[PDB]
């Protein structure tokens, strides 16, 4: 067969140990999910420094904690805008997930609180910026560089799926690089606890699985499709399906055809054909052997999964970091003031926050 006795025994024992780890991680997650934390700081405990990014109902600012001098990333959400954009359940869900999970590549929530106007989530500051910026600047990542990042996503999805969480918005824009060159996942607005199937149309056009586009009930296999898209974009510099308008992107996704750059290795193409598989009865990550079909594929033959988890592998790239509070890896935005009303807004809708 492909493995001799020593390698087969080592691989078998390794997979059993992963099961044992995940069983303990699920017990710890459920305890924190059932009893979430609330109100662990207040606004005047921090100095505001710079805006790191913004959405349609809030922004993320670099702040410095007054007592400790530590820097953090503070997400500020306007309660009135959250309601008007129908994002109440998503916002409460993101905070409940963040306070319950624990994994080396998931960002850590350190404080949360609220006032009359806004909700606040204070997370560790990840100073290297988005993978997106580095990928567009460098052009594309070599296959070993792409594989280093892909291995961290495989482990992170193995963890999340063991908790029955589907992620649903993987893309380079949602992956930050930390000071040691490892990945941090920060946003969980579209994640959902799903043991069986779910039906919501959500995600980003280039990364949507065919079964979402076709309005089917779907499961955690959409995250393994999105992993195929991410690995392709990292290694090519562009995604496998693109067009002027989303409707034409969707035509390409459901077609079952994908084309590859001539510099892709045969091992990489084989992995991608099995992740970007329209037929769910054939898609890697969705079969009887689960995540092991991915972790044991030839393209990952050089990957030491435990060493990646322990952060003992030397990263191919370390972002420029001149010191604490360095923001050079982030875009520049115009600074707007944080007004706090004299009257509580939307108190009933955000009672559990």
């Amino acid at each position: 067969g492909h493995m001799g006795n020593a390698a087969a025994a080592k691989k078998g024992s390794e997979q059993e140990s992963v099961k044992e780890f995940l069983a303990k991680a699920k017990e710890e997650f459920l305890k924190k999910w059932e009893s979430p934390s609330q109100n662990t700081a207040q606004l005047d405990h921090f100095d505001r420094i710079k805006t790191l990014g913004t959405g349609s109902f809030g922004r993320v600012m670099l702040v410095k904690h007054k007592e400790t001098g530590n820097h953090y990333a503070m997400k500020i959400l306007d309660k009135q805008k959250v309601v008007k954009l129908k994002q109440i359940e998503h916002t409460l869900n993101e905070k409940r997930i963040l306070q319950a999970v624990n994994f080396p590549f998931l960002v850590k929530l350190e404080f949360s609180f609220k006032d009359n106007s806004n909700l606040y989530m204070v997370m560790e500051y990840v100073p290297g910026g988005e993978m997106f910026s580095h990928l567009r600047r460098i052009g594309r990542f070599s296959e070993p560089h792409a594989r280093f990042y892909a291995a961290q996503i495989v482990l992170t999805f193995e963890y999340l799926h063991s908790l029955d969480l589907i992620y649903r918005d993987l893309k380079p824009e949602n992956l930050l690089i930390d000071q040691q060159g490892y990945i941090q996942v920060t946003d969980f607005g579209f994640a959902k606890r799903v043991k069986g199937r779910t039906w919501t149309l959500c995600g980003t056009p280039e990364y949507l699985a065919p079964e979402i586009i076709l309005s089917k009930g779907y499961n955690k296999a959409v995250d393994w499709w999105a992993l195929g898209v991410l690995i392709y974009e990292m290694a090519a510099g562009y995604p496998p399906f693109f067009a002027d308008q989303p409707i034409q992107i969707y035509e390409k996704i459901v077609s079952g055809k994908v084309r590859f750059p001539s510099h892709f290795s045969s091992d990489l193409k084989d992995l991608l054909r099995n992740l970007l598989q329209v037929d769910l009865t054939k898609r890697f990550g969705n079969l009887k052997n689960g995540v092991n079909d991915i972790k044991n594929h030839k393209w990952f033959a050089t990957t030491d999964w435990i060493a990646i988890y322990q952060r003992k592998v030397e990263a191919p790239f370390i972002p420029k970091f001149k010191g604490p509070g360095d923001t050079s890896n982030f875009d520049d935005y115009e600074e707007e003031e944080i007004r706090v009303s004299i009257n509580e807004k939307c108190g009933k809708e955000f009672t559990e926050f």
Binding site: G203, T204, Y238, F242
Partner: peptide
């Protein structure tokens, strides 16, 4: 080239969710 086609799509910047 395929790269040129990607540039022509106008979707080279940060992408929002639907």
């Amino acid at each position: 080239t395929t790269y040129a086609d990607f540039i022509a799509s106008g979707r080279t910047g940060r992408r929002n969710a639907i």
